[PDB]
Enzyme design. Sequence first.
Site, mmCIF file in Angstrom:
data_model
loop_
_atom_site.group_PDB
_atom_site.id
_atom_site.type_symbol
_atom_site.label_atom_id
_atom_site.label_comp_id
_atom_site.label_asym_id
_atom_site.label_seq_id
_atom_site.Cartn_x
_atom_site.Cartn_y
_atom_site.Cartn_z
ATOM 1 N N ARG A 48 0.954 -1.133 0.155
ATOM 2 C CA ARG A 48 -0.102 -0.010 -0.045
ATOM 3 C C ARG A 48 0.818 1.363 -0.038
ATOM 4 O O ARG A 48 2.147 1.253 0.527
ATOM 5 C CB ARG A 48 -1.002 0.018 1.088
ATOM 6 C CG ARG A 48 -0.462 0.193 2.443
ATOM 7 C CD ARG A 48 -1.398 -0.264 3.755
ATOM 8 N NE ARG A 48 -1.073 0.387 5.256
ATOM 9 C CZ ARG A 48 0.094 -0.256 5.685
ATOM 10 N NH1 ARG A 48 0.756 -1.360 5.416
ATOM 11 N NH2 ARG A 48 0.521 0.553 6.814
ATOM 12 N N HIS A 108 0.492 -20.187 4.706
ATOM 13 C CA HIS A 108 -0.356 -20.746 5.675
ATOM 14 C C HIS A 108 -1.745 -20.977 4.757
ATOM 15 O O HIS A 108 -2.129 -20.418 4.019
ATOM 16 C CB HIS A 108 -0.795 -19.794 6.743
ATOM 17 C CG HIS A 108 -1.013 -20.545 8.331
ATOM 18 N ND1 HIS A 108 -2.177 -21.169 8.285
ATOM 19 C CD2 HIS A 108 -0.383 -20.498 9.447
ATOM 20 C CE1 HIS A 108 -2.276 -21.745 9.432
ATOM 21 N NE2 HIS A 108 -0.845 -21.288 10.052
ATOM 22 N N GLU A 216 13.311 -19.688 38.535
ATOM 23 C CA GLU A 216 13.314 -21.271 38.466
ATOM 24 C C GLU A 216 11.898 -21.583 37.540
ATOM 25 O O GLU A 216 11.722 -22.953 37.501
ATOM 26 C CB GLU A 216 12.893 -21.694 39.785
ATOM 27 C CG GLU A 216 14.276 -21.841 40.604
ATOM 28 C CD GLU A 216 15.519 -22.128 39.908
ATOM 29 O OE1 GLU A 216 15.545 -23.430 39.441
ATOM 30 O OE2 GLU A 216 16.426 -21.347 39.545
ATOM 31 N N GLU A 220 14.842 -20.409 33.443
ATOM 32 C CA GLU A 220 15.618 -21.821 33.225
ATOM 33 C C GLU A 220 14.834 -22.828 32.074
ATOM 34 O O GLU A 220 15.435 -23.631 31.809
ATOM 35 C CB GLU A 220 15.725 -22.567 34.563
ATOM 36 C CG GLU A 220 16.442 -21.805 35.471
ATOM 37 C CD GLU A 220 17.962 -21.677 35.458
ATOM 38 O OE1 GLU A 220 19.029 -22.725 35.142
ATOM 39 O OE2 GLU A 220 18.269 -20.179 35.303
ATOM 40 N N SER A 241 20.149 -33.426 35.943
ATOM 41 C CA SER A 241 20.795 -34.151 37.155
ATOM 42 C C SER A 241 19.730 -35.354 37.570
ATOM 43 O O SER A 241 18.676 -35.210 36.946
ATOM 44 C CB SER A 241 20.914 -33.444 38.298
ATOM 45 O OG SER A 241 19.533 -32.828 38.949
#
EC number: 1.1.1.86
Lengths: 317, 317, 317, 317
Positions: A48, A108, A216, A220, A241
């Site tokens: 445009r 899409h 946390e 992370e 861990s």
Amino acid sequence: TMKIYYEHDADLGFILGKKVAVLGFGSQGHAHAHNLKDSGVDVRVGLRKGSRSWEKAEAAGLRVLPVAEAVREADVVMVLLPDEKQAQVYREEVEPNLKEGGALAFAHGFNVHFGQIKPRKDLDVWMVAPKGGSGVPALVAVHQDASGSAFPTALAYAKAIGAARAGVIATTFKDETETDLFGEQAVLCGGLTRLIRAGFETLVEAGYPPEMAYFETVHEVKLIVDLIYEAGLKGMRYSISNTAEYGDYTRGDLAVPLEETKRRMREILRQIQSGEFAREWMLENQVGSPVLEANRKRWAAHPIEEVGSRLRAMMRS
Amino acid sequence: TMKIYYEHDADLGFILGKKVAVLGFGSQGHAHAHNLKDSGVDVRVGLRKGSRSWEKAEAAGLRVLPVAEAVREADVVMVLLPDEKQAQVYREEVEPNLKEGGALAFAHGFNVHFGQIKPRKDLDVWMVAPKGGSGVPALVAVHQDASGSAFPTALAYAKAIGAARAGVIATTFKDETETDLFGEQAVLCGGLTRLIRAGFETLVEAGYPPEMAYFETVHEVKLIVDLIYEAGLKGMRYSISNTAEYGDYTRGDLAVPLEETKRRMREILRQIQSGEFAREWMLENQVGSPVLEANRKRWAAHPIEEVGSRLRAMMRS
Amino acid sequence: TMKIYYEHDADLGFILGKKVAVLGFGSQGHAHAHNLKDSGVDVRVGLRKGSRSWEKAEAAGLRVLPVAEAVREADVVMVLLPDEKQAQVYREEVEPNLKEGGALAFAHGFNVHFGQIKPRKDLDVWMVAPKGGSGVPALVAVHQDASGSAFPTALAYAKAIGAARAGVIATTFKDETETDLFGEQAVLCGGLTRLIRAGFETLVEAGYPPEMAYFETVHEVKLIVDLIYEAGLKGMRYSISNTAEYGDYTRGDLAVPLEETKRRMREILRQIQSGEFAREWMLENQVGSPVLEANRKRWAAHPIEEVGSRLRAMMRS
Amino acid sequence: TMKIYYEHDADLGFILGKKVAVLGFGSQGHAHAHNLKDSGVDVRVGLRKGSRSWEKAEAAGLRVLPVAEAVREADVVMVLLPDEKQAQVYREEVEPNLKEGGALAFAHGFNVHFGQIKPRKDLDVWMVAPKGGSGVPALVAVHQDASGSAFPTALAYAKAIGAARAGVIATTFKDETETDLFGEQAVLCGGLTRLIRAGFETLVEAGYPPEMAYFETVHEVKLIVDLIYEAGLKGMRYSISNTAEYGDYTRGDLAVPLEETKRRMREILRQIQSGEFAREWMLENQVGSPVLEANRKRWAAHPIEEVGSRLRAMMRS
């Protein structure tokens, strides 16, 4: 057990002799127009007049025209506009101006799958959906093959963009559209943000400092998702861990119970497949997106944003 | 409203005149020992004789000794072993050999917070928990201050490692330990993996191709989480399509309902805070980790792994 | 659709040139040692000095040695001890004394499947699980094949015991262990005893004489189960009276409803497969089996025992 | 703890030198235009040509013009049209014709708060919401302050209308709009009419004469509400009989239980705040208000209307 096509399967002869109009100049318009010119197909960007995107496109050194004009002189029209703007631009500016036997292309499937664009019976209608040799595979689908060569053309388009390198997967407009909406709603944005928010609120309401709640529950996440990206779930489990791994295996189900979650996700999927979600979203856009603007605001006010902004600033030093 | 300390607040005089024993040589042992030597403190790595880690540590050019020996000649012992191995190494090899008035240091509070290590009353006990000037902040906490200078020493240790640059946050062993376990269980690994698995199974059971289920439920997670990392939730919402944003705002709660999720997460947190989780995990390790090994295997067999491996291979070309 | 092996498939050459140590002398130790000598393989029984089993083994005319000694001179060690005693005997007395490239053999997979024995990487690890030509088939499984001939050896061991006659079925340690625990818990002992007890208590509480409650709920079970053994369920139905058959078909489901029972049994199986049952049992044995001794006592006091003892005495005349 | 402004805080200099266009001529248009002229500001009423309101406005002796014309010559445009008509009149007739740096004013925040009017960035946007010296206080809010004097102007407008006398309260468009919708839906019209209807139907179904049901459930409401208006709830309790007071205190909760009612009202408020109510109403008006016309009719047929009409006629004599 899926059909993969590579650079060797795709013949640039099916695109190089065709004029491509790229409509729109977001991230996708930019990349599509860029990589096509650098593969030697003549591109025009339809925009445009006097828009911010108009000047940004000229600055990248591309031929820029009004939308109607760009379409009048094109053999392939690649529509890279927001889902909610596509139907109107198709009706007013593509339908009247696109040559008969032309190709109408998408990144899409949403507007075609849900009949917001009912394309002329003479057009090819296909899609290339991307997700140097950086490993970005693509989906390709053909809704309508008037010429008999929609699929080779689409595959050529993917080659001309650099998507063929990591592999092009043949699918349908249905499966591309419905899996995209499902991911957005159930997992990628909808589910994940709700899970983070419930985590953060749980810790903050239990009297843990917001700063540490944020570390946390939000900061992370990247560490875990980078491992999943590189080496999948079993790689991710391998690297964390044993205490983390034990907690994951014995308390993950308590956070997110399997059968209840699967039940709720089947309802999300039902509303997608039934057309109810498409209807909801289409009507929302008819009346100025009241719910979108309302929710944006409530979510931008959330305490998680204040703490996030402070800590991201602190880390940039 | 939280106490932040920078490089200027920390005085390397409190560490540079001290001998540091680094126990263990994972990722954390490597980085701790590395960055300390490059800041001019004399480091010794304590390891078991003829281990794979023994040879890897010598190859990085560090002084390597048996654990008992490394401790006998140290003023600060930094324990960087798996949570389940720390207590035994403390009892047999640190407790008898660490000088009186010495410092015992941790990267994780778990064994001290839950009394698996009951440290001698004469020791300093503190922790530096990291999460060039790359923006890696750290937590610092002091459980026990016998000398009167545990906190300056800990802060110096963070300076000597390069953690002070982006800021050191003062906290407690309780808050570090309980927020870490909560994140692992409710959000980062436990919750997120269950949500992905329910998404993937929902699509595959509904007859979508597994390859495309994998793209829309696993591969695309990184795109969203990178935006959250850079610009938080409201940045992430800003960058995603309005269709994605609308789906997120109107269907996220259907996937993950707020009050039910918060209820279940409060139970996860209760078991952490009550010591029930620590007991469960400690006993698990007394009898050869049967549940850990059983779950690993069931999760490694999951159909999501086959499809993941195929597609990651395909993309590496 | 299962792989069956017979005497003809098994070659006694793979065992006859090997020294076999049988550890333990219960019913299984007795039978294993017995049938091996009578097939011409040299056997030694490993036992603790001055035990009741020591003297019983010498009385059967077998070479008896301390456990460590029996293992030092063996090529195959067949471990026939209670599940709860195996791990300690392996650690202290088999691991240090078994020649490299030796074979470690089991009648039950429990300790290997759940990692209570983590066998050396150089050993063969296999199992023969028995259930003249009496029709006693066996299972065989190989966990670990270091030599390349674990499976022929195991099959030879089954031949040397007389288990090959009725057929040896190849399986895995997983499937042997998990089906054994399931049978014990859901059907054979756990379920069946609860069903008998509920039957007996129902009649006695309804005022029927205990003697007759005992006949119709306990003594008559053998008659039914002998028919199932010989001719399966449809044979059993065929032989019982039509009144019994009609009652079975129309009221069995009222006693034991199908979907509820299957739900509860799926939970029993889940705790087996997840390692939770193994953990529970391993920890129980760490603290002197309090629950086992407590339950034994409560069940031995049950009124069903008094009446049972009286009537069995009365019948022996 | 709220900011109140009086006549003394407001300076008529900020309005008297400005031309005000009043759009619409209901009760609000009438009163706004009236009280402004009687305070010496030049007013023009914008209306559609040959309307019933056109002739009524000329009869009150006001300057009347077409809407586009009234706006072209105005400095402040006060929009006093039905919520559902405002957006179209803004788009077609105010947006193109209102001078740059002009002021756009409202009595209700609905269309601005929910983005049905997205006003030009150069305009002032504010609201005066009224509820001789009759004690009618007003709310004032400013959405957009381009000139730097939106708030003094708005306050002046309230002075020029006679709303400053009893006090002007500063608020936001959000709080005005959301509390208005809540009152209408939960209490003032929605809740109260349902409570009256349930009362009336309860008595009539129990066989009490409809005339007396009407007196004790509808006609007597005014007596109670007049006391609440004058002296609040505790004044109302004070004036009613002790028998009424005792019944109120001991049975009110049985009629309208507190926690259940508060739960349902929180859902009403959620749909307001989320934009769902605005969307519902906007779409309703796109398709000729089917539900409004349907409900009107069903409620106008209700037996309570026949009896009401008869008794009101009987009392007018």
